[PDB]
Amino acid sequence: FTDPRKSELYVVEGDMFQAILPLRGKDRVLKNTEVQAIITALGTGIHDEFDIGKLRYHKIVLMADADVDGQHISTLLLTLLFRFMRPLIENGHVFLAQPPLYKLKWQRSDPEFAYSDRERDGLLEAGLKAGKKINKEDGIQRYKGLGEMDAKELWETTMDPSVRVLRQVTLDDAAAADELFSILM
Amino acid sequence: FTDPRKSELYVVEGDMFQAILPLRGKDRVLKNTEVQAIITALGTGIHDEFDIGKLRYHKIVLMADADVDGQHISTLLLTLLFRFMRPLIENGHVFLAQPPLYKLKWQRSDPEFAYSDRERDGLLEAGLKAGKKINKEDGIQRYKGLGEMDAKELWETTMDPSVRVLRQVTLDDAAAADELFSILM
């Protein structure tokens, strides 16, 4: 069930087998217990001892808010991977999970989630023109932050491989993270 | 969201913030990357360096099949905790999650799950006598194993703090695990 090439490690930056590990907003970070856990859990070793052979997770999905802070941890973790386990990025293992930004509370249909303003307006338009009703004042929840949503509206919405919205991290993507980290010094 | 006293570490023995880490069926185990990850992730250190102060998870829930193997890993992990991090057990942090054993596929009502034969017969009886219909041949799924069920029928069913069925591990409970491990040698 939890075989290496059939499992994923999610890194929920707070502050199908899917493992979940947290990382909170905080270069001796390699000694932060949460980082060591994420690093240990990947099983590939680090720096010169990096061994793609011992990777235990097919996918490494990073989950945070692209609306808060500056992903100071999504840019902090990314740099860590880039200059300690870069092959994980190069071979396309790293990813970003976009949490839902909206919950359309249809009056009598299972709610729907939109991950972009555009998807909202279209889903609203689709639902309405399709005979679905929705309260005009508190019908559309604007998730400020993440996690503060609801377990299962966090699962069905971001862990569900079908409905989830994933965007792979490219070496270019990781390079910027590294620069921004450097510049934030 | 993921604060130490408000988060849990689930250990899914394969082969509210909830982190998930796997452990597969396999005393130098402390060098097994999955064990080191679980051990690192708890952040308390081990043996003489054990520090309840640095525990990062309020609850440590172990999830496996009480119908397969002999929880050779649930008895292996338990012993590890008992003789390397015993205070985690003593202070009532360890737990066992019982996966559902049955899925009552009601004809037109959200399915129901039973964790014991008794709960099955009663739910069936309740649903029927309540005007709900169910196919007599393939209406009641008998989960052989776990995980092979369905993501969200694994979540809503075992991660959901409301509906989940947890049973705390007592020092007595852990002592047996230790003996059985010893005897299995």
Side-chain angles (χ1 to χ4, degrees):
Chain A
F1 174 48
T2 86
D3 174 275
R5 46 188 157 62
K6 306 171 187 172
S7 39
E8 316 167 343
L9 170 59
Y10 264 81
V11 183
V12 185
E13 295 162 54
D15 215 47
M16 182 52 96
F17 179 58
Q18 304 174 302
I20 307 180
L21 240 40
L23 178 54
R24 293 174 293 171
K26 293 290 294 171
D27 193 298
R28 315 162 189 176
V29 297
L30 290 160
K31 297 171 187 57
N32 169 303
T33 69
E34 302 189 320
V35 183
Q36 287 178 196
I38 299 171
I39 295 174
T40 302
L42 287 164
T44 63
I46 189 181
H47 201 161
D48 295 300
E49 297 81 69
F50 184 86
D51 178 3
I52 201 70
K54 308 206 186 65
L55 178 49
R56 206 214 161 310
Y57 295 95
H58 185 204
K59 269 181 174 54
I60 307 173
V61 177
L62 301 200
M63 179 153 66
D65 299 331
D67 63 290
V68 191
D69 281 21
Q71 313 170 304
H72 287 24
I73 31 187
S74 187
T75 279
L76 166 278
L77 180 73
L78 267 193
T79 62
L80 245 56
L81 305 171
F82 183 72
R83 59 171 80 160
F84 276 156
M85 320 171 105
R86 176 184 312 209
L88 282 188
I89 294 162
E90 283 177 4
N91 291 288
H93 289 304
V94 184
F95 282 79
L96 296 191
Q98 223 293 133
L101 278 71
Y102 299 125
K103 183 185 181 181
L104 278 48
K105 293 153 174 167
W106 295 104
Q107 222 76 73
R108 261 160 177 168
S109 309
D110 299 297
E112 295 180 3
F113 304 74
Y115 299 86
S116 58
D117 297 339
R118 172 183 258 68
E119 189 177 2
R120 184 195 57 207
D121 315 320
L123 235 24
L124 229 49
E125 153 187 60
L128 287 173
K129 271 72 181 190
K132 225 173 305 183
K133 288 195 161 188
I134 187 178
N135 190 326
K136 180 171 65 169
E137 304 184 81
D138 63 325
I140 300 71
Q141 196 170 320
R142 155 68 68 55
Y143 293 114
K144 276 280 298 184
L146 108 85
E148 318 195 16
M149 46 178 81
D150 163 309
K152 136 201 68 71
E153 292 224 324
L154 183 45
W155 192 93
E156 305 174 310
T157 220
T158 66
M159 307 294 282
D160 199 329
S162 309
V163 8
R164 67 181 177 184
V165 174
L166 259 32
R167 168 179 161 294
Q168 181 159 43
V169 169
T170 48
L171 260 171
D172 291 355
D173 282 331
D178 187 295
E179 175 172 355
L180 181 53
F181 182 75
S182 291
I183 297 181
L184 305 190
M185 313 305 257
Chain B
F1 175 48
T2 87
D3 175 275
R5 47 188 156 62
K6 307 170 186 173
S7 43
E8 316 168 342
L9 170 59
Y10 264 81
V11 182
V12 186
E13 295 162 55
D15 215 46
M16 181 51 96
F17 179 57
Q18 305 173 302
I20 306 180
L21 241 40
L23 177 54
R24 293 174 293 172
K26 293 290 294 171
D27 193 298
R28 315 162 189 176
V29 297
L30 290 161
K31 297 170 186 57
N32 169 302
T33 69
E34 302 190 320
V35 184
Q36 287 178 195
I38 299 174
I39 294 175
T40 302
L42 288 165
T44 64
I46 189 181
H47 201 161
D48 295 299
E49 297 81 68
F50 184 87
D51 178 3
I52 200 70
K54 308 206 185 65
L55 178 50
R56 205 215 162 310
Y57 296 95
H58 185 205
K59 267 183 177 55
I60 308 173
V61 178
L62 301 201
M63 179 153 67
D65 299 330
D67 63 290
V68 192
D69 281 20
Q71 313 170 304
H72 287 23
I73 32 187
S74 188
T75 279
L76 166 278
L77 179 73
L78 267 191
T79 62
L80 245 56
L81 303 173
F82 184 73
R83 58 170 80 160
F84 276 156
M85 320 173 105
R86 176 183 312 208
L88 283 186
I89 294 161
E90 283 178 4
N91 292 289
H93 289 304
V94 184
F95 283 78
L96 295 191
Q98 223 293 133
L101 278 71
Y102 298 126
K103 184 185 181 181
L104 278 47
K105 294 153 173 169
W106 295 105
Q107 223 76 73
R108 261 159 176 169
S109 307
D110 299 297
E112 293 180 7
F113 305 74
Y115 299 85
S116 57
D117 296 340
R118 172 185 257 67
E119 190 177 2
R120 184 194 58 207
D121 314 320
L123 237 23
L124 228 50
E125 153 187 60
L128 288 173
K129 270 72 180 191
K132 225 173 305 183
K133 288 193 161 189
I134 187 177
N135 190 327
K136 181 171 65 169
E137 304 184 82
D138 63 325
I140 300 72
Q141 197 171 319
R142 155 69 68 54
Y143 293 113
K144 276 280 298 184
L146 108 85
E148 318 196 16
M149 46 178 81
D150 164 308
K152 137 201 67 71
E153 292 223 324
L154 184 44
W155 192 93
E156 305 174 311
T157 220
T158 67
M159 307 294 283
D160 200 328
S162 309
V163 9
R164 66 180 177 184
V165 175
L166 260 31
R167 167 179 162 295
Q168 182 160 43
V169 169
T170 48
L171 262 171
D172 291 355
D173 282 330
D178 187 295
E179 175 173 356
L180 182 52
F181 182 75
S182 292
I183 296 181
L184 304 191
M185 313 305 257

